[PDB]
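Objective 1b. Sequence-to-structure analysis of LQ2.
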Amino acid sequence: QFTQESCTASNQCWSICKRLHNTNRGKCMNKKCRCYS
């Protein structure tokens, strides 16, 4: 559920998604992370 948090990689965005919406299905876009479920 897209945030104003930053990423380096998608693989990394997952970690952020785990502490966001307990998921590993995130994507990194313009050094920002977007997550699912």
